[PDB]
């Protein structure tokens, strides 16, 4: 029972701790620390006097807390994407688990020859683009290089965006803002895309169409929904049909945790679903 669910959870969070602390020893700080402590415009140097101002604040007011106290289920998100691409290579098991799987498909004949694509050695700072976020939380981690974009931000730093909205156009490295609010972003650029904004048809399937295209090879999709139970099997397939596989399901307390992985080849993942389509399966992702 729950027993389980809190004893991996105080786990993780565990294991999140020791890994966060090494990795800050080696990075020295994080991402928005050291883009930010070297001002190019005078809106740079405002936006670091502002910062020296609110550390100076945080400083003398309170002690043993940092404002910002991240979420234990975003703690578990951090864990995963450090053992998936650092700690424990689980790209590489699931390049292995995959392969083989193609090599028994080609075996039956039931998968032609395929070109596919892989992913070169993990970057020192992963590109992490956190969609629908509230207060950028990735960017605590030293690790990440966090894109981070809301329908409506709160924080300077947060870019506005519908995700529904944007075009995904290969050949640029960076977002295009035009108007304030962004309109073009690069394609298959991010390690990992986080849809923090949960999704709740047509609209809650395309927003996945993006990610995919959005990700690198063999990149990441981490889905974070409450426990507010075979529909997870039921677009499951349907994930698969866009190209994903489910990598990671983890059942902490009250919140239900996913990851996906861009396979190394989408016809792949495509004939699987066709093998594992549960007869009544919608080709669409509802509720």
């Known amino acids: 029972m729950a027993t389980e669910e809190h004893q991996r959870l105080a ?13 800050t020893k080696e990075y020295g700080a994080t991402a928005a620390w050291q883009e930010h402590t070297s001002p190019r415009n005078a809106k740079q140097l405002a936006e670091y006097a502002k910062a020296m101002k609110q550390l100076a604040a945080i400083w003398e007011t309170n002690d043993g807390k940092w404002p910002l106290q991240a979420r234990s ?7 995963y994407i450090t053992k998936y691409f650092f700690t424990e290579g689980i790209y590489l098991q699931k390049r292995q688990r995959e392969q083989r799987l193609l090599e028994s498909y080609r075996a039956e004949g039931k998968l032609g020859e395929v070109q596919c694509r892989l992913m070169e050695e993990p970057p020192d700072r ?8 509230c207060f950028n939380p990735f960017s605590s981690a ?18 506005q965006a519908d995700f529904l909205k944007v075009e995904v156009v290969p050949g640029i490295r960076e977002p295009e803002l035009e108007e304030g609010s962004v309109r073009r972003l690069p394609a298959s650029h991010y390690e990992c895309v986080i849809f923090s904004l949960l999704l709740e048809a047509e609209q809650r399937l395309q927003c996945c169409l993006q990610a995919y295209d959005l990700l690198l090879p063999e990149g990441i999709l981490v889905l974070i929904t409450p426990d507010s139970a075979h529909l997870m099997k039921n677009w499951r397939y349907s994930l698969a049909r866009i190209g994903l596989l489910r990598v990671r399901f983890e059942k902490l307390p009250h919140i239900s945790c996913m990851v996906f992985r861009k396979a190394i080849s989408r016809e792949l993942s495509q004939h699987w679903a066709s093998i594992h389509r549960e007869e009544g399966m919608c080709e669409e992702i509802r509720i």
């Open 11 to 23: 786990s993780i969070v565990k294991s999140c701790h020791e890994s966060l602390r090494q990795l």
């Open 73 to 79: 289920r975003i703690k578990w998100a951090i864990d």
């Open 126 to 133: 992963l590109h992490v683009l956190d969609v629908g976020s």
């Open 142 to 159: 030293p690790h990440l290089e966090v894109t981070a974009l809301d329908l409506c931000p709160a924080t300077e730093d947060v870019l």
